[PDB]
Design a protein around this nucleic acid. Structure first.
Lengths: 88, 767, 94, 97
DNA sequence: CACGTACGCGCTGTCCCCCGCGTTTTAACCGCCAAGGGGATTACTCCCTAGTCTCCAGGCACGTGTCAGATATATACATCC
DNA sequence: GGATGTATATATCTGACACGTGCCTGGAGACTAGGGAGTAATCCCCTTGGCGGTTAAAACGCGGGGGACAGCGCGTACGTG
């Protein structure tokens, strides 16, 4: 059976275990428990869906289908997570 | 200089140096013979105790004392491979490599030997895979090239002659220091080639320095003794004379002969003529694709054995080994080091990787194979190769024109920088006399710079190749998906899908998917199965659903039955590998021995599939291809019929698609069936393809070695039926073949009994 | 398209404080975003200060109170000094 | 020669705090952003700089979260971070509140 | 995936410091002067200054040619085997 | 007699600078209206220093026992190759 779907759904597992370990090494974490990665994936999904929902709202105010970087900058700016290096 | 502005803030001084040293962390830090490759195993460890206890399975400790394994060790030369045993090893590095070898090969070898559900096809493909593993491992024993020699002092051994030896399929990182005695007792031909390369008078330092002093080319009518080889043909000698005539005026060119004529032999002969006759024995660069590169290597080994041809692949250490052992005659000198090699063979990837170490070489000649890869001026290979300091370049291809005149303009700008100024495009819907004058100017401008030889002008034994365009009605599912996509119907497009993730970006791609098969879309099979096929899914209605879901597979099924009842083998080319999956599942549930090749298949299994399909005792009937894969090095001598399921935007891709079976030496009349959906997006795909074919027949095909008529033919729109039997106006006719098989007729009563018996036998035998 | 930025002014300020030090494009975009963000914060605070006092104009007093509110601590009092002297020079001149 | 458990982690801590490259691969992050975006509406195009800005936002947010998580784990007399440390930090910040 | 060992967790002792309660103090709270200034409105007058308009000119942005410092070779004198 | 390290001269990269040019946005000059500064009146709220009386809350002392913390074992889960 060669049947499979075109749309992939396990891309939250695309944030791999050594990526989360590198993130914690940048955060200064020495030892990591085995249950950390699923919680980190859920937290990343929640944060990403919040920012992307605001960016999509900013895009469809402008009657556009393309999410620009400035919409992401405004979406991060409204929640108090202002980002430099893309505003201009 | 001095800062004119300062800060009045009394902030403390902060050391911003983020550089760190792990010297204080050395308390837990640091302050070569081991098993690397296991090749073969033997069932007798020390002596044959008997043939008893041949049943059951052995464990790991049972296999620790029953088998001896062939070991290639660390930093060894594949000639010191030892037949060892677990108690004869002890505790060395790489023991778990032997453990993994033992458990993996022994457990599933005895599993496939002891299972009852084993077919003969699986055991013969694994046996031939084992034999190919055996002889590719045995190939490493043969030397291929001696790099350097030295006098090394052993443990109280005075002085010993040591040779740096490269092997056949290994690279320069695996080159080893070995004794001279067994090397000269193994293959003296490579040794005497090494001493022939030692006292070399064909070095680049002993080169002619022709500055507008090109000698007049006498048109030679015989193969010179400079090329040993076999014997050059009349057209090969004509190409040699043409290339030497073109080089005699200091002009570059394109060898645009069709594939199969031996362009590699011609350019190796021209390289040898430049080496010997004109005394231009300097550094030459040849950039070839990686897949066809052994086919260049044996050509340099056979036709020009005296040349110092070197090969350039590998990781960083192998390329470093080539760089500081074989580039320079005097590599230890700090001054300007002269070259030692004559011809350097490389690929595009190492051009883009090592442009800094290869651009600072005064190249005398350049030969780029498959020049259509260079068809884009903005591609990074164009700036990688155009910045090289090369006096004379040459491009080898088969298709100089693919899509538009800008490709030819980029090619002639790579050849002649600034001399050619092709800027105007070709408008087919203009019919102007000045456009025909421009076409004739483009003809007469590149007459001496382009040499083409067709496969019908030479080797007058080729069977004719006929292509037929078949236009078939769409199904109702295809029609409703087409009108849902084109008149966007997101509520109807989701419908019964739980996810609802239908993406209507790339509308033309979705229209091509709808024209090919409705099952390409997500959540589309179950709507057909539950509503018309009754959803039982009992091995019989699914084949009927795949047959009747698309309007192309009814004609494909009729063609497969007709070629099954005759003595023919068929290849099917597709643009998308998901349609290849659809056809592969259809042929798997049909009961037809099929083979497949696409980009996901690695090269070893591709070689297995080609050798299994080209075998004289092959039970395979149909071979599926992705269109743009494998290059031109794929061998399909046993094929007869080519079915183009999906038409490409580039007609040269389709030309190389049905040219896989239509090469030199075919014993049967090659017939091509093109499957086209009616009144869909593929009709303008064929319009653009025929416009590009008209363009190639105008400029390229009429300038080898009625223009208004072919322009009017290209300007106009185009839009015993499956018989396997039989100037540019031909092969463009549309045969609207739509027999419209019935859904009930889609299943065959004769096959239905076999399918029901197979289902009853699978239910009785469970599994 | 003439795209507005604060490029040359930040560059000449950099040449004032470090005459032999260059700068990259990403750092320049970060500096531009910083200047725009600080200008937006101070202007919004001054607009709120004008709105709470029923004043329809924005003068140097609103910007001074906005600097004293937003910029924390000693950075405020030196910034207040630097601005205040400049207004004095500009009055002497215009 | 084997290393003590902990000095390699300290070496990666001192290494990854010096360099500033993105610690998440580009293509899985693009696939995750597109999958998260496609449920709000279908047919969404993305600029490369938008996905990059989302990437550095996720980097900064998750690195700050692991600093707070490490402080929670150190406060609980541990050197191993746990999901209870993560949920404790988010609450004191107000994300779970 | 295999190994191995460090650390999270459970248990026990111990001592110490916080909690509960009773008793004594004490200041918060509410209600009082005693006059005087600060500040919110209402109304009025005046005048300075910022918006608005017209016109012009040079600052900024882009593009391009050159130019001085940094880098990579070309050839000649001194030197080892 | 062959091979090797150092020294001045020329071609190429490379960011910075002089010149050119457009154009558009900021500046100069004049005019006007209105926003804000200033004045006076009226009345309520706040300030600083006192007083008297209630009384509930705060302060203090002491027993004791519950909980924080240290030590030890263990086994497993995570680090490492």
């Amino acid at each position: 059976a060669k049947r499979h779907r075109k749309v992939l759904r396990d891309n939250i597992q695309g944030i791999t275990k050594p990526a989360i370990r590198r993130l914690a090494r940048r955060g200064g974490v020495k030892r990591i428990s085995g249950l950390i990665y699923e919680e980190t994936r859920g937290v990343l999904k929640v944060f990403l869906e919040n920012v992307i929902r605001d960016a999509v709202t900013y895009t469809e105010h402008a009657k556009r289908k393309t999410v620009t970087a400035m919409d992401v900058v405004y979406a991060l700016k409204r929640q108090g997570r202002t980002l430099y290096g893309f505003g201009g | 200089k001095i800062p004119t502005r300062f800060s009045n803030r009394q902030n403390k001084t902060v050391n911003y140096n983020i550089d760190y040293s792990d010297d204080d962390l050395l308390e837990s830090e640091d302050d070569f013979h081991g098993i690397d490759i296991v090749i073969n195993h033997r069932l007798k460890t020390s002596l044959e105790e008997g043939k008893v206890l041949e049943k059951t399975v052995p464990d790991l400790n049972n296999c620790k004392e029953n088998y001896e394994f062939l070991i290639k060790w660390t930093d060894e030369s594949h000639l010191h491979n030892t037949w060892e045993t677990y108690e004869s090893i002890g505790q060395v590095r790489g023991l778990k490599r032997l453990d993994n070898y033992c458990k993996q090969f022994i457990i599933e070898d005895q599993q496939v030997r002891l299972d009852p559900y084993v077919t003969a096809e699986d055991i013969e493909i694994m046996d031939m895979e084992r034999e190919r593993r055996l002889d590719e491992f045995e190939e490493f024993h043969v030397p291929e090239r001696i790099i350097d020699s030295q006098r090394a002092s052993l443990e109280d051994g005075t002085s010993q002659l040591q040779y740096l030896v490269k092997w056949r399929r290994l690279n320069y990182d695996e080159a080893t220091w070995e004794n001279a005695t067994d090397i000269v007792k193994l293959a003296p031909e490579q040794v005497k080639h090494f001493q022939n390369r030692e006292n070399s008078k064909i070095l680049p330092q002993y080169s002619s320095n022709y500055t507008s002093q090109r000698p007049r080319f006498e048109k030679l009518s015989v193969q010179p003794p400079f090329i040993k080889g076999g014997e050059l043909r009349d057209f090969q000698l004509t190409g040699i004379n043409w290339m030497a005539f073109l080089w005699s005026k200091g002009d570059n060119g394109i060898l645009a002969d069709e594939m199969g004529l031996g362009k590699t032999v011609q350019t190796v002969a021209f390289i040898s003529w430049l080496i010997f006759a004109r005394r231009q024995n300097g550094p030459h660069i040849i950039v070839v694709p990686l897949s066809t590169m052994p086919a260049w290597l044996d050509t340099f080994e056979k036709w020009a054995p005296d040349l110092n041809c070197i090969c350039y692949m590998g990781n960083q250490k192998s390329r470093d080994t080539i760089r500081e052992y074989e580039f320079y005659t005097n590599p230890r000198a700090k001054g300007k080091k002269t070259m030692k090699f004559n011809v350097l063979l490389t690929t595009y990837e190492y051009i883009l990787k090592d442009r800094a170490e290869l651009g600072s070489i005064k190249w005398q000649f350049m030969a780029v194979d498959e020049a259509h890869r260079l068809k884009n001026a903005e591609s990074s290979l164009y700036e990688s190769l155009n910045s090289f300091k090369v006096a004379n370049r040459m491009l080898i291809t088969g298709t100089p024109l693919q899509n538009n005149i800008k490709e030819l303009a980029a090619l002639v700008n790579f050849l002649m920088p600034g001399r050619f100024t092709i800027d105007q495009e070709i408008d087919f819907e203009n019919q102007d006399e000045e456009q025909e004058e421009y076409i004739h100017d483009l003809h007469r401008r590149i007459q001496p710079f382009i040499l083409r030889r067709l496969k019908k002008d030479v080797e007058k034994s080729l069977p004719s190749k006929t292509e037929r365009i078949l236009r078939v009605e769409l199904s109702d599912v295809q029609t409703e998906y087409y009108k849902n996509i084109l008149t966007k119907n997101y509520s109807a497009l989701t419908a019964g899908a739980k996810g609802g993730h239908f993406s209507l970006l790339n509308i033309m791609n979705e229209l091509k998917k709808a024209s090919n098969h409705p099952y390409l879309f997500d959540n589309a099979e179950e709507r057909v199965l539950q509503k018309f096929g009754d959803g039982k899914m009992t091995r019989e209605n699914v084949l009927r659903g795949l047959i009747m879901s698309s309007g192309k597979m009814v004609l494909l099924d009729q063609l497969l039955t007709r070629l099954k009842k005759d003595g023919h083998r068929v290849l099917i080319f597709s643009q998308m590998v998901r349609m290849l999956d659809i056809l592969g599942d259809y042929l798997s549930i049909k009961g037809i021995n099929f083979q497949r090749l696409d980009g996901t298949v690695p090269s070893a299994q591709r070689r297995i599939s080609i050798d299994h399909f080209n075998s004289p005792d092959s039970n395979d009937f149909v071979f599926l291809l992705s269109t743009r894969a494998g290059g031109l090095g794929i061998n399909l001598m046993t094929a007869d019929t080519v079915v183009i399921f999906d038409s490409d935007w580039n007609p040269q891709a389709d030309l190389q698609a049905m040219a896989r079976a239509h090469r030199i030496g075919q014993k049967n009349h090659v017939m091509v069936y093109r499957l086209v959906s009616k009144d869909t997006v593929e009709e303008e795909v064929l319009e653009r393809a025929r416009k590009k074919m008209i363009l190639e027949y105008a400029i390229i095909s009429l300038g080898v070695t009625e223009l208004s008529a072919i322009l009017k033919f290209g300007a106009g729109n185009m839009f015993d039926v499956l018989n396997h039997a039989e100037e540019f106006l031909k092969q463009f006719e549309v045969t609207d073949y739509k027999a419209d098989i019935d859904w009930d007729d889609i299943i065959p009563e004769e096959e239905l009994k076999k399918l029901q018996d197979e289902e009853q036998k699978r239910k009785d035998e469970e599994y | 398209t003439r795209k507005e930025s604060y490029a040359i002014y930040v560059y000449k300020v950099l040449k004032q404080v470090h005459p032999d030090t260059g700068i990259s494009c990403k750092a320049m975009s970060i500096m531009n975003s910083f200047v725009n963000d600080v200008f937006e914060r101070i202007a919004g605070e001054a607009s709120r200060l004008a709105h709470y006092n029923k004043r329809s104009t924005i003068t140097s007093r609103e910007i001074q109170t906005a600097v004293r509110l937003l910029l924390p601590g000693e950075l405020a009092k030196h910034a207040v000094s630097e601005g205040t002297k400049a207004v004095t020079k500009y009055t002497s001149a215009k | 020669h084997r290393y003590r458990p902990g000095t390699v982690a300290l070496r990666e801590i001192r290494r990854y705090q010096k360099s500033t490259e993105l610690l998440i691969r580009k293509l899985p992050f693009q696939r995750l952003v597109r999958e998260i975006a496609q449920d709000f509406k279908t047919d969404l195009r993305f600029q490369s700089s938008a996905v990059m800005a989302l990437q550095e936002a996720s980097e900064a947010y998750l690195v700050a979260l692991f600093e707070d998580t490490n402080l929670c784990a150190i406060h609980a007399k541990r050197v191993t971070i746990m999901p209870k440390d993560i949920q404790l930090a988010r609450r004191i910040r107000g994300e779970r509140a």
